[PDB]
Design an enzyme around this catalytic site. Sequence first.
Site, PDB file in Angstrom:
ATOM      1  N   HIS A  47       0.823  -1.203   0.000  1.00  0.00           N
ATOM      2  CA  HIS A  47       0.000   0.000   0.000  1.00  0.00           C
ATOM      3  C   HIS A  47       0.860   1.258   0.000  1.00  0.00           C
ATOM      4  O   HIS A  47       0.678   2.143  -0.839  1.00  0.00           O
ATOM      5  CB  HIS A  47      -0.923   0.007   1.227  1.00  0.00           C
ATOM      6  CG  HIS A  47      -1.796   1.225   1.336  1.00  0.00           C
ATOM      7  ND1 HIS A  47      -1.822   2.024   2.459  1.00  0.00           N
ATOM      8  CD2 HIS A  47      -2.692   1.762   0.474  1.00  0.00           C
ATOM      9  CE1 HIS A  47      -2.694   2.999   2.284  1.00  0.00           C
ATOM     10  NE2 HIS A  47      -3.236   2.863   1.088  1.00  0.00           N
ATOM     11  N   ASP A  89      -5.895   2.645  -2.422  1.00  0.00           N
ATOM     12  CA  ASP A  89      -6.726   2.371  -1.250  1.00  0.00           C
ATOM     13  C   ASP A  89      -7.737   1.290  -1.607  1.00  0.00           C
ATOM     14  O   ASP A  89      -7.946   0.347  -0.851  1.00  0.00           O
ATOM     15  CB  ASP A  89      -7.473   3.634  -0.805  1.00  0.00           C
ATOM     16  CG  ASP A  89      -6.565   4.649  -0.128  1.00  0.00           C
ATOM     17  OD1 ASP A  89      -5.331   4.455  -0.147  1.00  0.00           O
ATOM     18  OD2 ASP A  89      -7.093   5.644   0.419  1.00  0.00           O
TER      19      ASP A  89
END
Lengths: 122, 122
Positions: A47, A89
Amino acid sequence: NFFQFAEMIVKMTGKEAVHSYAIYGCYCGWGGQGKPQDATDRCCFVHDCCYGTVNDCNPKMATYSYSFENGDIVCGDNNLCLKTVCECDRAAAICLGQNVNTYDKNYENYAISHCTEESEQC
Amino acid sequence: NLFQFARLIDAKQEAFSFFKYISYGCYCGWGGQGTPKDATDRCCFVHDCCYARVKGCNPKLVEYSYSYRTGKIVCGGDDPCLRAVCECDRVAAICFRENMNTYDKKYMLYSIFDCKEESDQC
């Protein structure tokens, strides 16, 4: 931003990713040092790179447009960068979903003695 | 990285004196919008808005070299990128110090009914 990112995980995994993930493995919360401890981790890890590479805008600040329609999360910003912070995300909250079972309640609220190791490059 | 940020924050304040920023206001931790709610929050903004100045390397995965001598986070490192980051934790950690008295739990774990304001830019 996280406000936006939390509501996304919290919409793929029950109703409050904020906690389990506020500090997990080595790259989930207040950390980011060492090597991914598992699924959730390789995720939390992947991420921040995803975030890192976005050089055009500010991933931590960007307020993008999205919608949870049909059980699928879709991004609605055209701004090629804002469409990315979301995609990162987005994928992230799908990453944290399909691996919720690998979650080791023994890795949250982590120290760093267990991660003082190499912060793998990305 | 944020491990070190947890560490530096504690130096002026007490050990583990960071759980209160995991989600505090509009910027401290999960957040990123609607303009601050107080001094504390801004440090969380100025700190955010600090990493964005980091030319080159990423702030969350980068471990820097630092030492806490007689109450002074000295950033002793020969790499401007890395040094910089340290300084975003030094300035901030010092910020929250003095601003732990304007502290109010009613700025904890918040959403989009408090930070939907005209989102102040860096």
